[PDB]
Structure 1
């Protein structure tokens, strides 16, 4: 149990690398503005966050 490389050398290695190109600079802020505030969805008090994979 002194052995190193243990946890990293017995884990599976997988990927699903992107084909889709993400935006930079201006447009990345444009989407951030619209998706949060100018949609306009919000409803009754909730905890949701901008992520939820629950």
Structure 2
């Protein structure tokens, strides 16, 4: 344990990972139009609670 009141504990002992590949941009011309047509054409409104675009479940 070391001690109760040592600052930066979970910041210090956490693991370290790196980044990934660079993403692109269309200044929202299709960046938000993709989620628009995902919510409109692709995802149907199911009678229930909700169905989000980021729902990875």
- Where on the TM-score scale, by shorter chain, does this alignment land: which range? 0.5 to 0.7
With 2-11 and 37-46 compared, the bigger mean Cα shift is at 37-46
Q: What is the TM-score when the length of structure 1 is the normalising length?
A: 0.59
| Unpaired runs of at least 5, structure 1 | none
Cα shift at 1:38: 1.9
Higher RCO (CA 8 Å, separation ≥ 6 residues): 2
Aligned length: 54
| Unpaired runs of at least 5, structure 2 | none
CA RMSD of aligned residues (A): 2.5
